């Protein structure tokens, strides 16, 4: 069969709800507390998804945990761009069925700039006509797109895994084949799209870092687990110790 693609569809996670009160009027603290809670929920599903990926257990347990944490934001942002595309044709941001951002929420959350970047990313899926299959292969490649500049524990297995995910995405790209203008260009397009996830995850990292720092002073609650990731791993990205692997320059 298409063994690889089968697996990706088989493990793809279901809907995750935020638990947000959509009849209260919007405040910053409520929206951000609902996002922090959704963040943890989606993290739980990301761990399960990731541990089921082809080859993922070739990695050292410590490389496993580290790439999950480093790549969490890019992953959630990408999945969310797809959900917005498929569920609402990119007019709003579909964080969750019970947490859809319109422009008013984009603004009340004080993440407008990041939200607008995310909506753009969402439009791109339309613009490029990304297939559900390309989406799934790209999302899988994003868990292997961000590493400590000082390398991983068993870096060689990582390098091999990533190469193999690059291959599978090349194998699956949408084109009329007797023309590599499409196929060579399709790949270019898709790798540009993947690259653009990184600055957005960086802006979001920056905003969440800052929010954790001042959280007591703005009544935002972080789940204990999110607090640890923000304070322990997040700052390695913001400080340049951990960095994306970019296709282009």
């Amino acid at each position: 069969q298409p063994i690889f693609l089968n697996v990706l569809e088989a493990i793809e996670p279901g809907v995750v709800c935020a638990g947000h009160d959509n009849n209260q009027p919007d405040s910053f603290a409520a929206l951000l507390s609902s996002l922090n809670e959704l963040g943890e929920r989606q993290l739980v599903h990301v761990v399960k998804w990731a541990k089921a990926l082809p080859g993922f257990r070739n990695l050292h347990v410590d490389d496993q945990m580290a790439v999950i944490q480093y790549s969490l934001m890019g992953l959630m942002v990408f999945a969310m761009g797809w959900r917005s595309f498929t569920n609402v044709n990119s007019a709003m941001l579909y964080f969750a069925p019970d947490l859809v951002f319109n422009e008013y929420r984009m603004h009340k959350s004080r993440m407008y700039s990041q939200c607008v970047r995310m909506r753009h990313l969402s439009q791109e899926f339309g613009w490029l006509q990304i297939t559900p299959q390309e989406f799934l292969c790209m999302k899988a490649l994003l868990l292997f797109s961000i590493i400590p500049v000082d390398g991983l524990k068993n870096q060689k297995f990582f390098d091999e895994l990533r190469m193999n995910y690059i291959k599978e995405l090349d194998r699956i790209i949408a084109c009329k084949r007797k023309n590599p203008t499409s196929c060579s260009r399709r790949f270019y397009q898709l790798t540009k799209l993947l690259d653009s996830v990184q600055p957005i995850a960086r802006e979001l990292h920056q905003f969440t870092f800052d929010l954790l720092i001042k959280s007591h002073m703005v009544s935002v609650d972080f789940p204990e687990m999110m607090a640890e990731i923000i304070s322990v791993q997040v700052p390695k990205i913001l400080s340049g110790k951990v960095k994306p692997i970019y296709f282009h320059t």
Binding site: V44, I68, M225, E228
Partner: peptide
């Protein structure tokens, strides 16, 4: 810490 124990279950 908190993430490793999640990773565990």
């Amino acid at each position: 810490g908190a993430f490793q124990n999640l990773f565990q279950s």
